[PDB]
Design an enzyme around this catalytic site. Structure first.
Site, PDB file in Angstrom:
ATOM      1  N   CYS A 215       0.875  -1.170   0.000  1.00 18.93           N
ATOM      2  CA  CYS A 215       0.000   0.000   0.000  1.00 18.93           C
ATOM      3  C   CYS A 215       0.913   1.222   0.000  1.00 18.93           C
ATOM      4  CB  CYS A 215      -0.985  -0.103   1.163  1.00 18.93           C
ATOM      5  SG  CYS A 215      -0.245  -0.584   2.812  1.00 18.93           S
ATOM      6  N   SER A 216       0.642   2.243   0.817  1.00 30.55           N
ATOM      7  CA  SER A 216       1.628   3.325   0.882  1.00 30.55           C
ATOM      8  C   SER A 216       2.806   2.957   1.795  1.00 30.55           C
ATOM      9  CB  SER A 216       0.968   4.642   1.316  1.00 30.55           C
ATOM     10  OG  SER A 216       1.893   5.713   1.043  1.00 30.55           O
ATOM     11  N   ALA A 217       2.540   2.598   3.061  1.00 27.78           N
ATOM     12  CA  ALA A 217       3.638   2.204   3.955  1.00 27.78           C
ATOM     13  C   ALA A 217       3.903   0.694   3.960  1.00 27.78           C
ATOM     14  CB  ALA A 217       3.350   2.663   5.400  1.00 27.78           C
ATOM     15  N   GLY A 218       2.997  -0.112   3.439  1.00 30.04           N
ATOM     16  CA  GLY A 218       3.171  -1.557   3.467  1.00 30.04           C
ATOM     17  C   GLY A 218       2.945  -2.234   4.822  1.00 30.04           C
ATOM     18  N   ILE A 219       2.074  -1.682   5.667  1.00 27.46           N
ATOM     19  CA  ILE A 219       1.782  -2.290   6.973  1.00 27.46           C
ATOM     20  C   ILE A 219       0.297  -2.307   7.305  1.00 27.46           C
ATOM     21  CG2 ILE A 219       4.067  -1.786   7.886  1.00 27.46           C
ATOM     22  CD1 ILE A 219       2.915   0.576   9.444  1.00 27.46           C
ATOM     23  N   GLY A 220      -0.470  -1.350   6.800  1.00 30.07           N
ATOM     24  CA  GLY A 220      -1.877  -1.237   7.173  1.00 30.07           C
ATOM     25  C   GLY A 220      -2.848  -2.075   6.354  1.00 30.07           C
ATOM     26  N   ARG A 221      -3.295  -1.560   5.200  1.00 34.30           N
ATOM     27  CA  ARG A 221      -4.062  -2.380   4.248  1.00 34.30           C
ATOM     28  C   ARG A 221      -3.331  -3.676   3.891  1.00 34.30           C
ATOM     29  NH1 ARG A 221      -5.559   2.715   0.230  1.00 34.30           N
ATOM     30  NH2 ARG A 221      -6.186   4.095   1.975  1.00 34.30           N
ATOM     31  N   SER A 222      -2.016  -3.585   3.674  1.00 36.16           N
ATOM     32  CA  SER A 222      -1.223  -4.775   3.343  1.00 36.16           C
ATOM     33  C   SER A 222      -1.317  -5.829   4.441  1.00 36.16           C
ATOM     34  CB  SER A 222       0.233  -4.363   3.122  1.00 36.16           C
ATOM     35  OG  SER A 222       0.408  -3.577   1.935  1.00 36.16           O
ATOM     36  N   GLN A 262      -2.824  -0.886  11.342  1.00 39.70           N
ATOM     37  CA  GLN A 262      -2.427   0.451  11.814  1.00 39.70           C
ATOM     38  C   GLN A 262      -3.436   1.120  12.739  1.00 39.70           C
ATOM     39  OE1 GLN A 262      -1.531   2.024   7.702  1.00 39.70           O
ATOM     40  NE2 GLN A 262       0.097   3.110   8.789  1.00 39.70           N
TER      41      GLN A 262
END
Ligand code: JPD
EC number: 3.1.3.48
Length: 284
Positions: A215-222, A262
């Site tokens: 995703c943007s940071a690679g921790i939330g949606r991902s 997140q």
């Protein structure tokens, strides 16, 4: 406790923030020294999101092997995932180098290039068949082969060529286009439908390298994507599906990348997705 009734018990008691903070308190803390070296500052999108040293993906390069990406290896479920940030202008070539070197079949993108009026990742794939992209720093060529646009997501077929060896491979791009700018989706139905389309393609299967998800940071949606996938697979494998503990699975995944899920709203949405998904699998 079981999942669906633990769920209603947290809703009625309004304690999602307390459950989520407990997870944050118990989560692993491992070093990320390579991510913080000065020479890597322009390879990180966010200063507080870094891969752990023990699980980071290494580029096959002797100058600088760093990319903000982690290998999440789930032993009981027998699934692996690479979770990474949305590529930056100066890491698009590294991104495709990783896809090539790790033998991935699929890329899962859970964000739009622009959200909330700001850029959340680079335009890292070609938008027209006749306008291919060349990444000179890593010697790769990328061509759009076909595109299928649906109401909640788009699937693209891409050709990646290693210009050093003239080898080519087909990569599938799965782009979930409708996650809202704020909050989480009201129903998990379209997210689950998307997950099943990724599964049906072969991109998550052992005959390929790990899927790359961002995703943007690679921790939330991902994190929501791989948590839901792994929990549903465990419910199919075990004699007692009600033994699957989503909080324990999430803590296991946080041994490999920091910060997965997140917000308390993302935690609640993950529960909802697994609960609804378990009914459709059966046997439904
Ligand atoms: C549903 C099929 C899948 O999505 C793939 N596709 C595609 O772009 O789908 C929109 C191309 C032709 C069939 C494929 O399985 C392989 C490439």
């Amino acid at each position: 406790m079981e999942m669906e009734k633990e769920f209603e018990q947290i809703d009625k008691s309004g304690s999602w923030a307390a459950i989520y903070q407990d997870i944050r308190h118990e989560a692993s803390d491992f070093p990320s020294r390579v991510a913080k070296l000065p020479k890597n500052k322009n390879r990180n999108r966010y200063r507080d999101v870094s891969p752990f040293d023990h699980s980071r993906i290494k580029l096959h390069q002797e100058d600088n092997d760093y990319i903000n990406a982690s290998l999440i290896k789930m032993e009981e479920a027998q699934r692996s995932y690479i979770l990474t940030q949305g590529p930056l202008p100066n890491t698009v070539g590294h991104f495709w180098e990783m896809v090539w070197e790790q033998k991935s079949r699929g890329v899962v993108m859970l964000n739009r290039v622009m959200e909330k009026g700001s850029l959340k990742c680079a335009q890292y794939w070609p938008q027209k068949e006749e306008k291919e992209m060349i990444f000179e720093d890593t010697n790769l060529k990328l061509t759009l082969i076909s595109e299928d646009i649906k109401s909640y997501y788009t699937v693209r077929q891409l050709e990646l060529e290693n210009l050093t060896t003239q080898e080519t491979r087909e990569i599938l791009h799965f782009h979930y286009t409708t996650w809202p700018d704020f909050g989480v989706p009201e129903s998990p139905a379209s997210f689950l439908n998307f997950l099943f389309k990724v599964r049906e393609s072969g991109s998550l299967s052992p005959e390929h390298g790990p899927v790359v998800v961002h995703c943007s940071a690679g921790i939330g949606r991902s994190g929501t994507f791989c948590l839901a996938d792994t929990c549903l697979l465990l419910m199919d494998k075990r004699k007692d599906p009600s033994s699957v503990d989503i909080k324990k699975v999430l803590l296991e995944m946080r041994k490999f990348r920091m910060g997965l899920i997140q917000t308390a709203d993302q935690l609640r949405f993950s529960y909802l997705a697994v609960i609804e998904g378990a009914k459709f699998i059966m046997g439904d």
